[PDB]
Amino acid sequence: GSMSLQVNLLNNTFANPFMNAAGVMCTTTEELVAMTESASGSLVSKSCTPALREGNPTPRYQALPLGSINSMGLPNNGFDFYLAYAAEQHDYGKKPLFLSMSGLSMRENVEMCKRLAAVATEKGVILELNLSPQVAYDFDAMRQCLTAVSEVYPHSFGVKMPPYFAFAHFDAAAEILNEFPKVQFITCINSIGNGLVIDAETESVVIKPKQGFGGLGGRYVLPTALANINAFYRRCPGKLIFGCGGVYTGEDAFLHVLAGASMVQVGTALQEEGPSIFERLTSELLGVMAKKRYQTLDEFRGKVRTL
Amino acid sequence: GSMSLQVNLLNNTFANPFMNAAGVMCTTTEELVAMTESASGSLVSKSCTPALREGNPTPRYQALPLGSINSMGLPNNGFDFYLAYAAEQHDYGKKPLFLSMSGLSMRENVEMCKRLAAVATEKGVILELNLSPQVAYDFDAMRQCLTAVSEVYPHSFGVKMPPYFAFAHFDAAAEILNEFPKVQFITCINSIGNGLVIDAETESVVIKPKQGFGGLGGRYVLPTALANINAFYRRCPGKLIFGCGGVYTGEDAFLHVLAGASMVQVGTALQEEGPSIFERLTSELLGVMAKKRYQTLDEFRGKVRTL
Ligand SMILES: Cc1cc2nc3c(=O)[nH]c(=O)nc-3n(C[C@H](O)[C@H](O)[C@H](O)COP(=O)(O)O)c2cc1C
Ligand SMILES: Cc1cc2nc3c(=O)[nH]c(=O)nc-3n(C[C@H](O)[C@H](O)[C@H](O)COP(=O)(O)O)c2cc1C
DSSP states (O other), X not given: OOOOOOEEETTEEESSSEEEOTTSSOSSHHHHHHHXXXXXXXXXXXXXXXXXXXXXXXXXXXXXXXXXXXXXXXXXXXXXXXXXXXXXXXXXXXXXXXXXXXXXSHHHHHHXXXXXXXXXXXXXXXXXXEOOOOGGGSHHHHHHHHHHHHHXXXXXXXXXXXXXXXXXXXXXXXXXXXXXXXXXXXXXXXXXXXXXXXXXXXXXXXXXXXXXXXXXXXXXXXXXXXXXXXXXXXXOXXXXXXXXXXXXXXXXXXXXXXXXXXXXXXXXXXXXXXXXXXXXXXXXXXXXXHHTTOOSGGGTTTOOBOO | OOOOOOEEETTEEEXXXXXXXXXXXXXXXXXXXXXXXXXXXXXXXXXXXXXXXXXXXXXXXXXXXXXXXXXXXXXXXXXXXXXXXXXXXXXXXXXXXXXXXXXXXHHHHHHHHHHHHHHHHHHOOEEEEEOOXOGGGOHHXXXXXXXXXXXXXXXXXXXXXXXXXXXXXXXXXHHHHTTOTTEEEEXXXXXXXXXXXXXXXXXXXXXXXXXXXXXXXXXXXXXXXXXXXXXXXXXXXXXXXXXXXXXXXXXXXXXXXXXXXXXXXXXXXXXXXXXTHHHHHHHHHHHHHHHHTOOSGGGTTTOOBOO
8 A cells, every 4th residue: 555754853854764874975065965866865964073174094994794893083074064065055955954063072062053053043954963981971071062052052953872781871861861852863873982893814903093993883783773772762752763873774774763763874884885775775664664564654663562 | 833722821721712601501510511521721600699590581592693682680500509510520620610700799799709719729710700880881889899809809810891882991991900910811791781683573672681682792792892802902911801702713713812812702602503612613713823824822812913
């Protein structure tokens, strides 16, 4: 019968839940256009700092059989660039736009948010604030960051979270997030931090920054991502959860949604395949839903069965 | 090509670096005997509490294409049983023995160590104290725990660590462990905590306890294990590191050792294959060493090349 990947949230309509992960194929004008032109339901711009940033020395990304490792070091074109893309260039007629922000201090985030507010009101761009020790592993730094943005930014927004690995941490993070009604979505997860890939043939690490230590993505991270999606799905019932981590197929995405995901972001798989991946993912997810006789995402979002 | 997998540490000689991971295939008398009869260089008994524990309701372990998920809940025969095995049954002639301890409180570890001391002294059993919201993720508690144990246990021991994901955490944990000369080895890592596996066919989780959340092992964890091994190798130059996580082949073990491992523990792969796996692994590591023109482990232990 009839089937739909449509999602409705944050006062927008999305043709499907798929979008890129912040930082993957969303740095340059061409990349942003290409994401807008793709079959994805949305897109998010590369996490930005106030000024242009070169990022870390190369090699700083390596694809792997089971995913990827990277230490990009936030290379990006600067806030003015992404702001201008949001203000003047993005076709909102095609799909909604998220802007990812990753200031190097609280003060940097405060300053960009003050400027973002106008473009968010007028054009409807949606902030994804990157919190992902790094800010979200320090609950005090995390509270302080959110308080500061909330104070100065007169709009809803969402937060991109590093993975946690303990229920006490799920509770502590959710408790903080729930004190901020402007945080209306939570993106789980960023990379699994600081893995170390060694190439047995060269007896060496495979990226240059940080003695070879870098964030893991891809097949490595799927169960951690599902854990985090579901953990915050349960503990933040007043908020949406966006999934990110280990999506290569419609079936993978199906798992994200079962766990509680509203949108589903694609990192490593998109890096390897390019924006055409979104045509395949939509098809595949529709195929999974057809075989299981689901017609909408609402039917099974967050309905994973426990034993 | 005269090669040796010999390891020498804590006044002991080990034929090869391989042993079981604590908790895999060593809960019962039969299992400990089979581990002693196997080709492994050593073995460690199931993490013990003061009294026997039934553990969590089943299913509580699931093997996966990329590894395993479990929430066993420390099922074990109790401290008296493993103490008795160490004191009266274990053939130290065949290989050295480690005893893993996991009291649920500092007081419980203290009282077990008081009684373990005499057996360590007399028979040579070596303690691996399991610090893996839980205690390893709380740095003040960790110091307190090690102070308490160090006060009553006049022998070298090692600690079993959960993975960390941030350089600031590597630094903080290492600084504590470096306060304690009795901590002569560090085992990296326990499982990646609280993953969530969801079976797309059944639309459900795969283990019963804790709504399907459980510790991940196997291929999922290898780069995290290598990071922690190398992280602690670097920051604790006075100690040895035992690797644990994602070892299926002699090549995996080669990577553990390059990262800095002295002993190499085998969990998931051993659960799936049984103790004969140790003949395969010794054979495969020698093959990898012959191809790379190494004769001994310390020729390349810790010698991973950075860029
Ligand atoms: C090359 C690269 C660049 C990334 N850049 C960012 C970023 O700028 N901001 C961010 O929040 N996450 C960033 N990430 C993390 C991804 O957004 C995503 O959280 C992670 O890769 C998990 O998704 P995957 O398993 O689909 O790769 C990056 C990941 C990669 C591989
Ligand atoms: C069924 C099972 C039981 C375990 N029991 C223990 C335990 O009692 N004590 C402990 O420190 N670690 C325990 N672990 C964790 C392993 O020691 C090891 O740290 C982890 O499985 C990663 O190694 P692997 O990737 O080789 O599985 C257990 C793991 C599994 C799968």
